């Protein structure tokens, strides 16, 4: 057990191992209770997150367990990883607080982009390499957007802030909805991992143009912008929409054909236009997969099929389990004390 020390940072007690020095808050509350520190063991600048109210409800205790399980699994260059997890508690009986540690990441895709074709090739390659890994473990991100992509001075990228979202959060003229696949925005059907590829298309279009692709003022305005570009649905997709009311609403709209993407993305690399056509497909069954997109000619400069790794299998059977607060808290304690740090 390391030696812990205490200090108060912006109205908050922090009790952390001596290896972590120079704790200074970051985000102005945007990231939660998150400090920058220097890690004397590894020499890395790190981010330390102190969870708020981790066991306050069944919902909150399960969410804490879910976050720790996902962060302990993800071991990939293009995905957030866990450098450490700790508690000052010496037993289950006195366990209350959880702290998570990762690489300090001060800039997101907006900070760098709010870009040449080469920059777009490399940034989208890295998102797709990370997603091939995530999808191979049957994990769905569900919230890819520029603020959830960390980028450094060498244009190296990591995916963070996995979907673990409020009705009010998704209402009106908001970036929280602009990157969402239509089938999840309007609850058309059971969604799967293809929702993430729609988001990658939206991000790639905005890196090429400098403009949000579907900046809707509300859910309905946003669906009109999407159908103007990709076309109204055919009979085959309408059959897959499980809500009769959602089906009836779509059939009230005047039919529109798919637009010519070379006349929308004027001057772009033809290979970029072709890849956008394969991502931004309304029927999720017909979208290009991450593994297929890595092999597209647009990424010929970067693609190496011997350096695009898959994940170990990920058991999420807990998601269907009904437990008490103290059962979720005990499972979380076991995962803190069993953590093994990376080499
Ligand atoms: N500067 C700044 C921001 C910053 O460094 N990042 C964004 C906030 C997350 C918070 C976090 C910490 C540990 C485990 C999961 C998530 C990570 C780091
Ligand atoms: Cl220490
Ligand atoms: Cl990381
Ligand atoms: Cl504690
Ligand atoms: Cl964003
Ligand atoms: Cl597992």
UniProtKB/Swiss-Prot annotation:
Binding-site positions, ATP: 26-34, 49
Assigned GO CC terms: cytoplasm; cytosol; glutamatergic synapse; mitochondrion; nuclear speck; nucleoplasm; nucleus; spindle pole
Catalytic activity: L-seryl-[protein] + ATP = O-phospho-L-seryl-[protein] + ADP + H(+); L-threonyl-[protein] + ATP = O-phospho-L-threonyl-[protein] + ADP + H(+)
Entry cofactors: Mg(2+)
Domain Protein kinase positions: 20-299
Job description of the protein: Serine/threonine kinase which acts as an essential component of the MAP kinase signal transduction pathway. MAPK14 is one of the four p38 MAPKs which play an important role in the cascades of cellular responses evoked by extracellular stimuli such as pro-inflammatory cytokines or physical stress leading to direct activation of transcription factors. Accordingly, p38 MAPKs phosphorylate a broad range of proteins and it has been estimated that they may have approximately 200 to 300 substrates each.
Protein name: Mitogen-activated protein kinase 14
Native source organism of the sequence: Mus musculus (Mouse)
């Amino acid at each position: 057990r390391p030696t812990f020390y205490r200090q108060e940072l912006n109205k908050t007690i922090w009790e952390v191992p001596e290896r972590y020095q120079n704790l200074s808050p970051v985000g102005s509350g945007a990231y939660g209770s998150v400090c920058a520190a220097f890690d004397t063991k590894t020499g890395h600048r790190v981010a330390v997150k102190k969870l708020s109210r981790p066991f306050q409800s069944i919902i909150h205790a399960k969410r804490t367990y879910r976050e720790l399980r996902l962060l302990k699994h993800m071991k990939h260059e293009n995905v957030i990883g866990l450098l450490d997890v700790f508690t000052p508690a010496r037993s289950l009986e006195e366990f209350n607080d959880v702290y998570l540690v990762t690489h300090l990441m001060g800039a997101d895709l907006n900070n760098i982009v709010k870009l040449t074709d080469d920059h777009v090739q490399f940034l989208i390659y890295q998102i797709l390499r990370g997603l091939k890994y995530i999808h191979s473990a049957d994990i769905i991100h569900r919230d890819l957007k520029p603020s959830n992509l960390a980028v450094n001075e060498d244009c190296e990228l990591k995916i963070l802030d996995f979907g673990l979202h409020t009705d009010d959060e998704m209402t009106g003229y908001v970036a929280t909805r602009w990157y969402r696949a239509p089938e999840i925005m309007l609850n058309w059907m059971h969604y799967n991992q293809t929702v993430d590829i729609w988001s990658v298309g939206c991000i790639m279009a905005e890196l090429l143009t400098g403009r949000t692709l579907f900046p809707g003022t509300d859910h309905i305005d946003q669906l009109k912008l999407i159908l103007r570009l990709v076309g109204t649905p055919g009979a085959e997709l309408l059959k897959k929409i499980s809500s009769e009311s959602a089906r009836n609403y779509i059939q009230s709209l005047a039919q529109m054909p798919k637009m010519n993407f070379a006349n929308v993305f004027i001057g772009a690399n033809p290979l970029a236009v072709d890849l956008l056509e394969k991502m931004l497909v309304l029927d999720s069954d017909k979208r290009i997969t991450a593994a297929q997109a890595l092999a597209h000619a647009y990424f010929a400069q970067y693609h190496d099929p011997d350096d695009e790794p898959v994940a170990d299998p990920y058991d999420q059977s807990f998601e269907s389990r009904d437990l008490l607060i103290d059962e979720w808290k005990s499972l979380t304690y076991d995962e803190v004390i069993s953590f093994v740090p990376p080499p």
